[model samples]
Target: SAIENFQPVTADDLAGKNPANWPILRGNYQGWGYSPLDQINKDNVGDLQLVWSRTMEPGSNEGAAIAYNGVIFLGNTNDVIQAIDGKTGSLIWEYRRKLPSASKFINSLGAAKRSIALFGDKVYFVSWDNFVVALDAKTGKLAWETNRGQGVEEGVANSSGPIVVDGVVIAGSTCQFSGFGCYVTGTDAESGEELWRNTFIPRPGEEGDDTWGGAPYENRWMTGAWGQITYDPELDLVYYGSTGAGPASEVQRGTEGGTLAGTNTRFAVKPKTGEVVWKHQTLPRDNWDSECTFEMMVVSTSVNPDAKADGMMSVGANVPRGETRKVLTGVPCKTGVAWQFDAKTGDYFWSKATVEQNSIASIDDTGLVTVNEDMILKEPGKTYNYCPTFLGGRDWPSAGYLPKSNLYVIPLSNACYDVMARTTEATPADVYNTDATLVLAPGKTNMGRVDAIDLATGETKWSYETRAALYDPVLTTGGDLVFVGGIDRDFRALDAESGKEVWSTRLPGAVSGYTTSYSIDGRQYVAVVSGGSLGGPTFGPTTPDVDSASGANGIYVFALPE
Candidate 1:
């Protein structure tokens, strides 16, 4: 096979930050979402024009594209993969799976794939059927396929994609309807062979088992890692975030007063061996459906946290500034809290809240989180308002990082919800839940926000506001610009350092996926998809005359005139 002879993507290739061809979902292994291309920078961005537009099949566009050489790789709903010429936007090839009816239910739940991985000569993605599939990068032919979750448990689906680390394709599971929580798996990228599996829930005699408060293994649910997975070559470890448990109330699980052991935890695992090296629970005893399952952005930086930092609402004692260290940081959940930890040890460095949140009362010096007692669901049929609605202050759309300035550009929503708990009862599929009513957070006039925070000083440099809630990620570049699209059908480029709009344009549909940038022959181009997102349009009704529609699904590419 020509694939066997093609140069395999190395750890050094994945470790690069200035991406000429985006090879990973988050642009690179660091999850930076940046492309160091300066052909169409701030000074001349006003002249940017559409280079090409490709209409997509009827489905969601909430996925990111991976580019290599001069080809772009994309995945859509129902496990559809395509290879397109990056320069002309012409179809190179398309691979579609003939899914069974049993697998169709997962797509109904908004199977807008979040990302796909490009490694060696194959493109990898988790199908709606919960299978790890590899396609020939050049021909779009099936190379190998293996089940990563199906048949292991009911309702084990995947909405996100995988990251290749040390020749292992590491993917997370979405077990919202499974009884035994969820698990993350590592498979051989070349042969599609399962290497190892690591469960999020603790077993009978393993560490943290007692933390389940005696709930039977069949009764424990959720805690899935359904987001992007990241790898750190320097530390030789993989990182992923775990979601909150099901039922939304500990009492319903018959484990009242127990803090679920592994839910909402950040895990650092060995990619090749699937060995969990360390973990830190960002949100404990979560009862409001605030999932911490998002991106674990890695960076090398000095540590410092101060309550007095500009525009920062910090907690716990600061990890005093000292020698530079590899750090894991991001708004890893719906709660809008940006946390920093030692990437090598999973030790807490600091955290800052980016929105209005009342669920967490305090975080002690040792990074022990204390929840607001009033927010706990102790009685059934009772309701409490929780800030930062389940839709999240930060949702599936990832943030972008500027390595040179140490600034993290994040997307956020400003809303709250009145949630009600209920008695435990699992459906045939075992999906447990509570109910909630959405509302704008108190005293907030806007619903969307983009904040740029400097990790070194824990200071927010600037914030951009919007009337429509933001459901898009950010794309940063060496051109000193920040590009983002919104639910308003508007795409704009802002000064990376000042947050000032440099150029703006309107699309036919809502911006639905991760915006990315790449270059071919020294000419830079930016690409973004527009279409439906489960959360973007739902926030429309409450957005006060701010209306946007879906169904105009297409990829819009822009570049300076030829």
Candidate 2:
């Protein structure tokens, strides 16, 4: 059965059927942000009028909304979770937490939940204080939370929701620039007890320590596994990516690679035991903030007919290519470059950048990617320029996929930046101060483009241009529509096959989260969060005309007329 009848969602329900319910925030463990619903096809998308909309609490974190059966699990600015009626957009029950002071956990904690996991009889979410909190699915009563041993680092917190695998709920970390490293933990789903924990920073005598030549652990900054986590049930491996080394300076970082075993790397781990099966690095010695460590997906698609079984032999190692392949695919936001690898073996296949870039010289591929080392500031008080800006070509909103079209739709930035030091004091703390200026490429008009890349060949099939950065992830469907939003405040439905605008609506926020899809009792709907917050420089330079004001976040859900 492709679509199962409505019931309480389980781990298998998420990994298989029930795609109509949106069991997790990133959709399923694959993190594809796709919907199998075909009710609102391209032809009828123009009639997709506003159904019922809700206002989130003032100043909430931004991400996708999650739902199951007839309920939507909503997370707000603080440690507030709401269970609402999906059919009418009415609140059912809410759970609010008394959290630590915001000053103590500002960067470490957040409420823009990507998705809350519904497994067994409870819904699970991570708190700003790093506790894995579970609540009753029907009543929203507190089931359990953490006392101690929840997280190792002081800056540790959960930015996204957990991916449930075989009764274990696996969640990631988004720790700030604190003293220690961050980790992803697999905990007993019912008790919140630690089952297994994997750290991005390794200890002395550990298997990964040799990569650093024994660099001090504190220097392993910005190594948090801060993005989407996908699972491959066939191989029993969990996949996730980590941010690049801090200071975004090529020479300011460690040796050959960014943080040796840290920054801009992806890991395939045996979640039950916290064992690494294989790893890949996209940006080694990452400087200029070209992070290749955002969201990656395990997609089942075919190779091009003219492509080789041993295709992608150009720059480096190749993924095992077959006529039709189950490959690991994603365009990490920072680079706007899509990548393909053998999902079963974690083998590198190929890469392509959708946006114009002068920073990355192609990973020919060293330091993971070969940086134009000449531009690296060997001496202080120097300035350097790069493409796609320091924000890469994209940011954390991530990319969306439509399996029917064999395409991935991503939002991209055409803006760039310039970096120069403010002083010449040569220490990690002192030298970090710098003045960055945003630059528009000569006479470039549209600040960005929403691109549809052919999965079989990893090339742009079509693109829809935007006046400014499209700062949201997309939701594609079997009906041939692309649901994505922009910082310019346009929540649009574009034709998936040709990138044609089928419909559009203006909203209030900068549109900084996921454009999601789900249904209740056969009514399909598209929902997106608008204008809460835009990330700081780490996400890239914002356009001047974005809609921004205090306490203006809102969630808008739409569907075709009844």
Candidate 3:
């Protein structure tokens, strides 16, 4: 009956099933990016090798690979989808969409493949131009393609891959460049008929419309779902995080004064009808560009009868210590904060900003976030120093969760931002169309730290810091090891519990992509994508010293000593 409880899947199911064999964008439905396979542990990880490597068409960066039933599906810069044999690394089939060089908006340097979703016998991915296409899982035959014309601006692209749920493929749009607005839409996996579309920015008559302060300005609002979507099967709800408005500063956005815009928020919506069930706004009028592109996870936890109704206590009743029940955890990029919410009721339980911040004076007693006056940048020529910078205490790279240890591991950054003013423009065309420089505080240095947080207590159990920008999540295994990649071009495995370095190997390029684990036959293997794109600040325009150590982009997979 294990199979009965699990959804019926095919060879392609391996491609995108939860635990996924590589499924969905962030591995499984929960987006934990953790795999249970541990055939390759610390003892043998030192022997990992380049089983085989393939050079993908250059465009954005490369995305994580989805391997299922001995086949691997991935996307490259040229907007091409390739199916390869997982065992031998031989190309199975390749389909490339004809796009233009001027499509620079979509193919921005860092605009690499985010991910692909596999359902039944079909594989789905979005083109740089915002076309969602379905291909035959085995033959790479074009099933169907629908173009959702690049909304609003050139930089408003589709980078987040499609996620399939109960025969519906959910896709998100990304646009930080121009006219800030984005949305998430679902389509029938087989027929490609759009099921529903939900806009990120609330229009005039919508519930959150007043939140933006009415006017001609309301016509051009920008809030996009530029990341992965996580689904809860029991609730039949899909959860997604949103990105900030087009212009990074609030003053330029043309609100009367210090008004909170519903920019960076997370939505829990009905997957079939696209009706918002509940919402949690992470940052009001988020001028810091704290896009919720990071990963979110759901776990089981017992409710403590003795726990206070206020939700700050980390303890629970009826659950033995270390015992697990259902709990939803979210890791937000840029802000570097981990938020735990009651998934059933959308109640704020507890949250902690991973790094020091002056932006928010404090999270009020009722869990409401109050922004500090000094931290608000309302006028030109005024500057405020905020920690973790807009680059994030962590970014789009996903994190991992270990059920055995009851620990949630995250890749964090230690940096700060000096936000100054940009002169406001009269029209939306000028206000929303411009990009300004975000000054980095003088002492900014890359301090990458991986923290293992106690899931029940919400306390950090262990932390490991390095000089490189630690951007990806920790991949844990049954063997008590955690695997991660870094901007320093190092791929290493640490003792999951103690955070002790066990094994590390230098790679040709920066291991900036998402790390994943799987067992083929009885042997476990670890994989990471090592490459660079211009989109992320850390990727492009690196100092000569950093560039020298970080090699060119490529995919690297390793295995233990046979």
Candidate 4:
């Protein structure tokens, strides 16, 4: 009777609210995954505890958990979405979808459930086979479901979650299979009606049509917009990054040389009508499958008024002197590069390769990425070692922006992949065949590192290493603490600014899912999903011998000491 009396707030109420207010997808618009709440600040984070623990079935490499209105929401590989009571870890409700056998392809990459988007009183998520459904927040009743079509065979799948903007639910598709081109779509949140769709590949007469080799290859497009979507309410623009063709080879895909056909591209579009305002391709002729579908953060920053006039003027500035500008920083996968673009005009600010890389010789004077001839595998039958493997230096797990310290805490993977051209004749649709084997280089034991990056200077201020892969979303609270989960099955709390380990506890399974924090009845609580998906080697026989000793499935929720 008590819970029934509560009324849920609408999306409009969350507009421009604190990052913690929505903390799940891309902090309220501007997509900066940063939060201003500092109650768990740096000085007293060591006192955190396991106030409670709730367990759920494992097997989904989904994104972090989401918190809103004193409730935590998450999805599992069983094709079910569960909402738990934030304080006592009680199951509030679970909604399950009956999927078909063809759904196997999408779930092959492990349970493959990403995060969920909470808009007003509804929760939105895409099933394994491409069904976008929304459920009532308090009750588990279905509000609406949209048929987005199964994209499995098209080399596309749904991995990332959706974002709600001005009453519209926006999401992208992921196609890792052959010949499948990815795209983004916006649907009316209330009516479940299709609004607009923007294809990643350029169609006939499209602007980028000329970028691809004159004829045949122009149609051979592959870029999935399956990561995160950030929105700028003021600009009315939704920002999305696209994935490269399934494989990283230009010859296999058709064109030659650095081709910016579709992959590794970022687009700013009108949320309501899906009109392309501007687009920027990060990699040309991507031979490394270096997709731009990683976590991207858009923040408003004040820049030096005289910092080059390549359209870096402020959002509403009519004259161009030295005014502050709101910029969107697109962080691409594998390359470990961070770039800043004028949000209003799509002008380039500055880009820095955060890791040691040889695939690219230099960014060049025009911000263009020039491939390194030496980095190419020219020797027949020999594999080339590429640093920052396709798994990315940073994957889908979003980094955290601590407004209190102006530091962006990111979880990074230090790994590499060995790549070689396959001499066999494989059709475009058969490129990602089961027989297609990619030589992955040996990975390091402590390949995960958490870095606190200062947004103003675009530099790492502090760093901490982990014994396992850190692929979960970062959470910060008003208590001045940062919380994150890892594949090692450990839930941890770190100094929000220093990256120092304050406390950590083992979970019942691998904590590969996203994390969220909330307070109920004046008590703070944290929750995370610990299911293990079967996609990557981590869930297979390739799992390290040491990791085999720990349990690898289940959800875990905790709370602080009273």
- For every model shown, the clashing-pair count is 0, 4, 17, 35
What lDDT tens digits, residue by residue, belong to model 1 across residues 1-562? Answer: 2122345566666776446778788888878888887787888999999998788666768877676666778887767788888889888889988866744463244256877787887888887777888988778899999976553235677777888998899988887665567788999999899999887788787888888778887777777888888888888989998887777777777666677778888889999988989998888888877788888788988776667874344543546476587899988888888888888887778888888888888777667778888988777778888887878788888999987798999988888878877555644253445677788888888887899998877889999888887788899888899998888878889999899889989888888888888887777889887786875656777785876777688888899998
Query: Which candidate leads the pack in lDDT?
Result: 1
Error of 2 at 9 (Å): 1.9
Off by over 4 Å in 1: 1-8, 102-110, 151-153, 310-320, 422-432
**Candidate 3 local lDDT, 17-62, one digit each (tens):** 4342765555567766677676666677666776756666654454
Q: How much is the lDDT of residue 495 in candidate 2? A: 85
Model 2 compared with the native: what TM-score? 0.90
Better of 1 and 3 by TM-score: 1
Model 3 CA deviation exceeding 4 Å by range: 1-20, 103-110, 151-155, 215-219, 256-261, 302-325, 424-446, 534-551
My TM-score estimates for the predictions, one after another, are 0.95, 0.90, 0.88, 0.87
Estimate, for each residue in 1-562, the C-alpha lDDT of model 4 and write its tens digit. Answer: 2235445555553454643344455445565454454445555555666665556554555555566655667666656787766666677888877755655564254236677787767888876667678999777678999888754443355777788877788988876554547678888988999898878677666767766555364346556787778877788888888877644555555555546566677888888888889877766666666777766666666543332322221222232224466777646566667666788787766565554455676564345667777655344345677766666567677777666676667776656666666666435544421122322235445666677755455566787777556656676555556777766666788876567877888776556666665555655556666655422353222235435223445556565467
Ranking by lDDT: 1, 2, 3, 4
Model 1 superposed RMSD (Cα) = 2.5
Q: lDDT: which is higher, 2 or 3?
A: 2
